[PDB]
Amino acid sequence: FNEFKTPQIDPIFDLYVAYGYVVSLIRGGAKEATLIPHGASYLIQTDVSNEEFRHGLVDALSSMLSLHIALAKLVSDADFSAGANINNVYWDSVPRNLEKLMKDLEKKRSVKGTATIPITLMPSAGKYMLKHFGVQGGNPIKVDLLNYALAWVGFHYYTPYIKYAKGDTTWIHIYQIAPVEEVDMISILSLKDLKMHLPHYYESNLDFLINRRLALLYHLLHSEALELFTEKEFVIHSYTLERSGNNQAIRSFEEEEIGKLMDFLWKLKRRDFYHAIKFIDDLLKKATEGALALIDAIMNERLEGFYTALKLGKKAGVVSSREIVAALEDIIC
Amino acid sequence: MYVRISGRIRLNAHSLNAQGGGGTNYIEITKTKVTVRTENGWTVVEVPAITGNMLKHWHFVGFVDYFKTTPYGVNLTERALRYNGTRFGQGETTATKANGATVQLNDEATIIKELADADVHGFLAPKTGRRRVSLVKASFILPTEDFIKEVEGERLITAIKHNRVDVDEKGAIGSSKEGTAQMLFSREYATGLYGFSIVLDLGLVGIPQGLPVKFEENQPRPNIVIDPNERKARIESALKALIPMLSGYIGANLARSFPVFKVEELVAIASEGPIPALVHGFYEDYIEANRSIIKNARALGFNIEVFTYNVDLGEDIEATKVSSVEELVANLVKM
Amino acid sequence: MYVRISGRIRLNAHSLNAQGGGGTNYIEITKTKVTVRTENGWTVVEVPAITGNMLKHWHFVGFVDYFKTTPYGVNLTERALRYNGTRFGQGETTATKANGATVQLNDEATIIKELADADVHGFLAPKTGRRRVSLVKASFILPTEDFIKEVEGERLITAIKHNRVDVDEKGAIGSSKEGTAQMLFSREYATGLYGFSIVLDLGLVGIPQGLPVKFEENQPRPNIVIDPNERKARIESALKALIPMLSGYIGANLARSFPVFKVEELVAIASEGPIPALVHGFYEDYIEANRSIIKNARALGFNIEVFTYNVDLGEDIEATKVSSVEELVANLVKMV
Amino acid sequence: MYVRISGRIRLNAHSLNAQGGGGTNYIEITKTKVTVRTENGWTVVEVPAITGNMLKHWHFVGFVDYFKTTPYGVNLTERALRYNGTRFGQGETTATKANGATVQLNDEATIIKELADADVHGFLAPKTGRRRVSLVKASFILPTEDFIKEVEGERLITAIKHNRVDVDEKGAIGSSKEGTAQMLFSREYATGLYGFSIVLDLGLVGIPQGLPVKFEENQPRPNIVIDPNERKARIESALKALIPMLSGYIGANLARSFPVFKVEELVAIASEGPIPALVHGFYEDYIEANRSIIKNARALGFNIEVFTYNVDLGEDIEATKVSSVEELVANLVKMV
Amino acid sequence: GWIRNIGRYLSYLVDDTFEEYAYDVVDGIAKARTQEELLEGVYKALRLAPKLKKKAESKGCPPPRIPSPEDIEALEEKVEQLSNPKDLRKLAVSLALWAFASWNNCP
Amino acid sequence: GGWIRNIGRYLSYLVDDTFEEYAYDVVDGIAKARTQEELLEGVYKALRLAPKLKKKAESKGCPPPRIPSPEDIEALEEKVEQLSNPKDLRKLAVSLALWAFASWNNCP
DNA sequence: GACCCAGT
DNA sequence: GGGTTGGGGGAAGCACTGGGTC
């Protein structure tokens, strides 16, 4: 039993850094591991040595550099380079740190530098803090390279994100699952499957990505991952990085729960599968304003939401399959 | 002087606390969550709530409106008339009044006298410190869980589309290159029964918090560093600023929504000295709890006058039957 | 000079405020959930309603029509005369005057000195950055609580199908692919004891937000940009824009719906000063509220002018028994 | 020049404005829910009514019929000559002139110059986006509130069942097995003391809405794209279109319809300036509302002429006693 | 469940294969809350039987099957004791939900 | 309870085919009524066409229609007097008219 | 406190 | 009852104060 200590800085940043510990220990084995939740600490309990932890990190960063150099001061189009990154100054600074550990971890040397965390990994960051009177200069939140590198590895593989640019503006929505009572390797590895690599949709037909609460449904639709949430308990945390008119700021940040959405989709896509995706995609593409009434009815069990969306969507175009109607009444009864 | 108003409000179909419209087209209204106890458990609902920043901004708006009536309207900052509410800055030491007078930031004594807006809501000056606490405090406007107990569902969010017609040099319609402004967006309006609670601190108007008392004749008296006759006028300028609240001037989109506003029930306490707030207009047990809190303050030596509007509030309390906010103000302006 | 009008209207047979789109059949009417009692708790009930946007647009339409007759009608936006409410949208850096001139976009007062549209309904200047708060505030149109309590919400919506007769020159209507754009569409119509609570703030006309006062000898004097006679004429036109509100020009689709109207109980308060808004007519027991809003407010030192119709009040205040809204606004334009 | 007509008429067993059966035989009539005062409380009841689409279509038919009389009837629409009310259905970019020429839909002024019907009735050109709101507003046709109070509805439907006779050379009715036509369908008809109200905005004919005035010398001067004689002829045709609006050419069912439909009382106002619309006949107390709206308006220095029937509107009103319906628009047209 | 045999008739008035497109009845039945408009709305849907009977024959497919009266009373016997809106909406919304289906029987 | 189906079977013979009799006016008036008085008027108008339909079915080969029992008349009479409020009057006004359209085997 | 940046 | 049409196209957020570095 080693019980790797995890520093507590931010409830969201600590989620990313601690939840990203598993991607390295899997590369190094670490059989019989667990992750005890603490709300924000989220401590890993594993009976493994510290030496293989760096062997996990070197493989993870080799994968990161292979992804980065493949696409294209050099700026890629990956999650850690330009996908979820809203600030251009971190388009090249972030990879430079990632390759920097190649001169530090390969020959078994500890970290000595300390970098600046961007807003994408942790929204509470910024430039203008308040201590006693007025503001300051730069970013007072400075993160050591050890905890800095452990966040991007968990961010790229596990937590998904949706990007919808439409030319000058840009909307980035980031969702992540946080365990709250217990979790094991069965769930944390399964959550990795939800990641959407290169979620660059653009055009104009795919406008349904408006609003975060509507983009989460589209992200979840095409990922029929593990449905363990019917017996487990998990929470979804989401945040947006709006860049309307080249104005990088956060305008939407809400806390919801994913278990009821899991149950809704699990109970919906059971009688048939061919027509359910077609129906939901049609209502999302055509009934842009109507799918909000459908998504809102899920976290509160709203009866009128199950009808308003269908009413507003049928007028444009809807297949309206038979087996899916019986799926809604399975939740209703 | 020291007035605590609270109660329940029935307003519906109102656009308050929108998401802007910088690039988002569907302007969905803010959505909140509230817990409610039922069937030996707790359940939540996605119901909107309005922040009290709207209430504070409208108090600021009404303060200058009722301050321009009296001939004492000279002592007011220029930024207050344009609804700025910046209150100087990290390096701004001079003030911009209606006549252009300059004010030096050295202490609250020379600030609350020459300026009136900076005293009700406070100010700050990081260059020289001297922060002023807001004398008026607002509360978040959220729907009561009694309405949830009797509803626990329904849409209660009216989504309506609005169109902005546009014309060309002769009446043509463009798509993406003709230079048109045709737009088709959505607006969500909120309904339900909410609650309100406002506290006023008129005892610190013209009296600095650092030296609230004179204390030079072995007799503690209020340290009114301003002229009493205009201090009394300033009392009403802030007391009547809550009148527009009880009429409909709440939130934004007033030109296009103007919430259907009518208070069903309220309770207030007025006193010469500091007094506790009764209850937020949220919990079901908001009457009897007040029935307790009054007897929790009378035994301590507080000359509290209770004003009730559409509530019996028992019979032992010497409450006054109030039928509107205006006669409450008229009964408070005397003292 | 702030005036508050609030009252009832037996507005019925109207397809106003309709949610439909080109590619959307069955153009249906707006429905707003409301809170009522129905001898029980504060329950929620569905009922058709009308948006205040519409009322604002039709107030603009009436205001420009009544401002045409004014001798200073040349000082108005050309697009305003085109029955268009697009006041400084996106795509242009300036507007066009009625005579064909333009408007310059740095100072707020110079925008409204030769234009009477942004001085009566506000404006927005995207590229420049400046903005102006609105003058007239319109409320939603909701029926009385007791009306929907007695009928407990029995549909209250009538859907009528309408079609055209687009027959070809030969005299036959065959296939869609034939070229006959002829079809069946449905319109929803509603009824009820609706209510409105429009408010106007004529004390801010010609007063720029940046520099509302001058204080050249340190005296109370708001900074007016237009001539006082021009300001009086603009205020009179704004007040005269209220007659079409009850005259049937509530909403669009008058060519096919033109809802029926009748002057119900109305209350108007105006005393040329800061005045609180009135109580909306959506609540059945609001009349007694009007017996307490202005009962003691008159004793506060305000020369409140009250004009009432179809209500006896508490027979204790100086409430003028005005016949209709045109006499009401005639009594208002004579005191400015 | 603006005109407002309203009043009370009586209909007896008319099948005007029906949904259009379909396979179904009972040809269900359009039912509209309206408010009823009632000594107990405000209730709602459904009654058969007539939509405004009809009134507008029949007004257009009368307008084109009386415009054919004028020598300048060449500048018309081929669809208008064919009694078609549709305006540029999607599928064609340009249009066809009634003379047989082709009308280019690129300028609103040219469209209104070459199309007299679309100038007053508006149009819709989604292909090029040309829009113009109609100068005529038509309301519904509803029974008055006092009528419903004194009759309580009593389901107010007269159902008569008809058949179709298909007699061939053999003279066999058949059994719907060879290709015959022997079926039984039902048509219903409605009666009641209804009301009418139509608004005419005859001040924009010949003037595009995009450019209402020229202001060549900073003076009010409307810009007309046509010669004044054509404008006067169009005004005369529009005024004469209202004469059949109370004669019987209202509704549909041109094979069984045309009930009595004679006016019992009518009220009208006419003035070149902006004037309010009179109360549509629906209520038992609209007479004094109209009296006030026509009396107080004259106090504002408005050159407005009021015509009335049946009700003299007291002795203080100088309104003449107009008996028929053509003399009203006639006295209006001599005063231009 | 006496629902699968009645929802297909409600679906007959929304499907594209039968172009009559009457959503007024669906809107009336969806927003039925207290005691009466739920029974009144379903009347409008069940009345338009001829429409569908003629429209199916006008194209070639067999006429639609009218729901059997063996289970209609299940709504009347259930709406009585379920007077409160707590569980009455719970089935009123499902009645309108089952109206938005395809039921492709007219190829 | 029990008589609703019996009266609905009778009302079914007025809207079904194989009878050449289609009178929707009365069935429309029975359901979407406003006052208790017109309910029994519509019931009478629907019930009046008993003898004209009791004989044509057997002539066309269909079994004769089963006339509703006179005992159900007592129930429908005694249900309406004590219930005068319009709140729960429309539900019974439309309950009997609902069974007019069903799958009754009128002509097997 | 003046610099920085993007791809259908 | 017996057939013709079920939207039609156009619009379905611009500008506006970007927040990080160094």
TrEMBL record, chain A:
Domain of life of the native organism: Archaea
Pfam family, one: Cas_Csa4
NCBIfam families: cas_Csa4
Protein name per UniProt: Type I-A CRISPR-associated protein Cas8a2/Csa4
Organism: Pyrococcus furiosus (strain ATCC 43587 / DSM 3638 / JCM 8422 / Vc1)
Automatic annotation (TrEMBL), chains C, D:
Keyword Membrane listed: no
NCBIfam families listed in its UniProt record: cas_MJ0381, DevR_archaea
Protein name: Type I-A CRISPR-associated protein Cas7/Csa2
Pfam short name (any one): DevR
Keyword Lyase applies: no
Function recorded in the entry: CRISPR (clustered regularly interspaced short palindromic repeat) is an adaptive immune system that provides protection against mobile genetic elements (viruses, transposable elements and conjugative plasmids). CRISPR clusters contain spacers, sequences complementary to antecedent mobile elements, and target invading nucleic acids. CRISPR clusters are transcribed and processed into CRISPR RNA (crRNA).
Entry keywords, A to Z: Antiviral defense
Gene Ontology biological-process entries: defense response to virus
UniProtKB/TrEMBL annotation, chain E:
Source taxon at top rank: Archaea
Disulfide bonds, paired cysteine numbers: C61-C106
Protein name, as recorded: Uncharacterized protein
Organism per entry: Pyrococcus furiosus (strain ATCC 43587 / DSM 3638 / JCM 8422 / Vc1)
TrEMBL record, chain F:
Disulphide bond pairs: C62-C107
Protein name, UniProt field: Uncharacterized protein
Lineage, uppermost ranks: Archaea, Methanobacteriati, Methanobacteriota, Thermococci, Thermococcales
